[PDB]
Amino acid sequence: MENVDLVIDLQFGSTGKGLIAGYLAEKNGYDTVINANMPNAGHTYINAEGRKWMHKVLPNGIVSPNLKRVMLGAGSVFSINRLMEEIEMSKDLLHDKVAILIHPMATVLDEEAHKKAEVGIATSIGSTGQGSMAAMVEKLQRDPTNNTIVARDVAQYDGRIAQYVCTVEEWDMALMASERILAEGAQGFSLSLNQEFYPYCTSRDCTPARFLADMGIPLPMLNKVIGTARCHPIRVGGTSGGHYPDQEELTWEQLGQVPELTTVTKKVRRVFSFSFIQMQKAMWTCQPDEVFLNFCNYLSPMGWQDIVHQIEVAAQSRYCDAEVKYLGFGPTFNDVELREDVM
Amino acid sequence: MENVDLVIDLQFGSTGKGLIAGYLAEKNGYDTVINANMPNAGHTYINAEGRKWMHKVLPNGIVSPNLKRVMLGAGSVFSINRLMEEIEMSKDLLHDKVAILIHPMATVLDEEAHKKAEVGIATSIGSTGQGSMAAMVEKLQRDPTNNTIVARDVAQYDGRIAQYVCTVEEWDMALMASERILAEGAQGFSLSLNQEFYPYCTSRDCTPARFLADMGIPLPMLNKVIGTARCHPIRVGGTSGGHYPDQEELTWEQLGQVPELTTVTKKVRRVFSFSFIQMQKAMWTCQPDEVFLNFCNYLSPMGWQDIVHQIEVAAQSRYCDAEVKYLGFGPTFNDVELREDVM
Ligand SMILES: Nc1ncnc2c1ncn2[C@@H]1O[C@H](COP(=O)(O)OP(=O)(O)OP(=O)(O)O)[C@@H](O)[C@H]1O
Ligand SMILES: Nc1ncnc2c1ncn2[C@@H]1O[C@H](COP(=O)(O)OP(=O)(O)OP(=O)(O)O)[C@@H](O)[C@H]1O
Ligand SMILES: Nc1nc2c(ncn2[C@H]2C[C@H](O)[C@@H](COP(=O)(O)O)O2)c(=O)[nH]1
Ligand SMILES: Nc1nc2c(ncn2[C@H]2C[C@H](O)[C@@H](COP(=O)(O)O)O2)c(=O)[nH]1
Ligand SMILES: O=CN(O)CC(=O)O
After folding, report:
1. Which residues line ligand 1 (CB under 6 A)?
2. Under 8 Å CB-to-CB from B210, ≥6 apart: which residues?
3. Which entry of A28, B8, B53, B218 is 20 to 30 Å from A7 by CA?
4. Which helix (H) or strand (E) covers residue B123, if one does?
5. Ligand 2 geometric centre to CA of A201 (Å)
């Protein structure tokens, strides 16, 4: 039954999960791609030809040459307008023989109401203010008169998603019928609701157990976990929370790099030195089998080789057999290197 | 690393998870007992001597002869008054050499405000109205001025829990230092937020993936899953939701048994015939290794033997190796029989 490869972030997010998901989809040729994204932030993949996908709804794995199923988990929070645009942009990949399945209990974002509710926390905790938690709360209220929050009910008056919304039985059968599955996790380990930075965190745990639960994947289906990390972990701009005791906040000037910003709000990302403590904590809970170490282009060979080294000993210390298999030197498929080939 | 035994419910709850947890604790002698309960759930264990434990906070596994650690997960929602009463009632078991650990992000119930917020759903969906979701929502709001919702902040002004509230580091170390762990799940598979009965469901998924996430247990620690079921599945009284297509609602008079009353409330439980569809769905997602079939005292030998049989074929059909190892014939330790000894 072990046929699921799960992509997980080991730090505070924006490690390049979109790039490794697209790289693994092209290399391994999964028939099923699945996720449980909320509108907090996007995922970027750029192939060998320079074609770019920037997704908030659809998995980046839709680039798989053997694609048959695209699955949006029960933990999903999505804009219907955005989903329509993403499907349209990749119409060539999402042909007649590709089934798009939206879990009946996936949450429909009310762009006006859900973002207006998060205006306060967007400043107080540096929240993305995308309406993720406000939409989640509305679903949790379980009011039988509210037919405007879950995909199953919304589809009865908004026909744009009616062809995609499946039953719970169809969801379990789609997973059962799958040969090889790529499960795409979002956000970051240290952003977990139940990690130590509360309330400077997201609205859920960002762990393999929580991502498998949000996608309705039974635990025996898990084949391997692919953990992602940066040489210099980031946080979003503003009063976005603390860091670990073994790390320090840096400036983009100190790195000799162009300041990283969010795509839409243009908020300058906060940047930190590598944390071994964060790595031990992420290793203990996430237990990855393989690691992707990205943004190696920000350091000299001695620098990123030392971090590869720190990661593997941090894994061993927390009973984890994780091996750094991939190294990122840029944002495209061409910038992903095999560790064995460069060190 | 495989040292966690997880107790989960395969139906709509009240299958007797409290009884099997207490039975397994006395037989296997776990040093660590862990859960992530909410005030909607009551759990009962009665030992061989007649001593009764009715818990809403503490795991029932505290009856273990080798008890060293009692752990209340980050997913916990608890009344401090109730926790105080449960600790006092089991003072003999919770001696100086037993460490009680409350996750820093476990939620403190505000009995007035959280229960008042759930008055509506207590009738509309037959919710227990115990304040579980209202407390969960307050934590999700992540307001930095609110120091009254998570255990970590509450421990700074309410000294009743200050000795028990640990750090996230202490939590991971407690799990790492443990020899054998009993993880106690609550509610039921079919009550899951993302099963087909929405909005007639609870405020989370009741699956092994969600319960391991709510207790902060890494996936490689899972040794085995013990699924629980009744011969006649139940629901709470009122407009509490639908049933599966292969089952029918019965009466307590039709069964010739005394009407069961809900633990948190006082309402008469709704009772149904066994559902094979429910069992296949629960088997597919929960994937138990062992099964406890309880309330066999409500049927004749031919009747419960047929149900044991249906369960095992439902498991096989969903690629699950589950074996019915235990049979319940009453509410005490003495009423738990090994299947091999009676059929
Ligand atoms: N090594 C690299 N060098 C430079 N830019 C890169 C590199 N790898 C990825 N990027 C860019 O970094 C940005 C953040 O990455 P991306 O959105 O894919 O991350 P993510 O891990 O999926 O984020 P999150 O889950 O937090 O939304 C993107 O604009 C991406 O193209
Ligand atoms: N075989 C049995 N026959 C009769 N009564 C029983 C039997 N087993 C347990 N009981 C009683 O029936 C009730 C079952 O609820 P209990 O708290 O034990 O279950 P639970 O599975 O832990 O509940 P929850 O849904 O809240 O997680 C209790 O009052 C218990 O003492
Ligand atoms: N990089 C990144 N940060 C996120 C994401 N989701 C949440 N966060 C961070 C931003 C804030 O510091 C904090 C709270 O934001 P939010 O969950 O949107 O309310 O979590 C994500 O997908 N990526
Ligand atoms: N039997 C049982 N029902 C529960 C439990 N927790 C919740 N429920 C049911 C009662 C309602 O039908 C539904 C909504 O309840 P609540 O989670 O209290 O809002 O879930 C539990 O532990 N046992
Ligand atoms: O870089 C991506 N952002 O975090 C999301 C957006 O603002 O669009």
Report:
1. A 9, 13-19, 41-44, 186-187, 294-295, 297, 328, 330-331
2. A209, A210, A213, B192, B204
3. B8
4. helix B119-124
5. 37
Alpha carbon distance B280, B247 (integer Å): 14
Flag whether A239 is marked binding.
Answer: no
Q: Which of A322, A21, A333, A297 is nearest to A186 (CA)?
A: A21
Resolution in A: 2.1
A172 and B284 within 8 Å at the Cβ level: the answer is yes
- For residue B297, with 0-12 CB atoms within 10 Å meaning exposed, 13-18 middle and 19 or more buried, which class applies? middle
CB B124 within 8 Å of CB B239? yes
Domain boundaries, chain B: 1-343
Q: Tell if the CB–CB gap between A137 and B137 is shorter than 8 Å.
A: yes
Residue to mutate, A35, A40, A43, A291, ligand 1, most ligand atoms under 8 Å from C-beta: A43
**Around Cβ B143, how many Cβ atoms within 10 Å?**
14
Of B121, B208, B286, the CB nearest to A142: B121
Residues whose CB falls within 8 Å of the CB of residue B97, separated by 6 or more in sequence, listed in order: B68
User: CA A178 to CA B132: how far, in whole Å?
Assistant: 37
The two three-digit tokens of residue B273, written as one number: 């015939």
Query: How far is ligand 1, taken at its centre, from the CA of residue A43, in Å?
Result: 7
Pick left, alpha or beta for residue B217 (phi over 0 → left; psi -120 to 50 → alpha; otherwise beta): beta
Give Cβ neighbours of residue B316 (< 8 Å, ≥ 6 apart): none
Q: Do the strands A52-55 and A32-35 form a parallel or antiparallel pair, or are they unpaired?
A: unpaired
Sign of CA dihedral A257, A263, A266, A269: negative
Question: Which residue out of B148, B198, B202, B316 would a mutagenesis test of the A interface target, given it has the greatest number of A Cβ atoms within 10 Å?
Answer: B198
CB A213 within 8 A of CB B213: yes
Compute the distance from residue B282 Cα to the ligand 1 centre, in Å. 38
Element (DSSP H or E) covering residue A20: helix A17-28
Cα torsion through B223, B224, B225, B231, rounded to 10: -160
- Kindly tell me the sign of the dihedral angle through the C-alpha atoms of B113, B116, B118, B122: positive
Nearest to A24 by CA among A209, A285, A223: A223
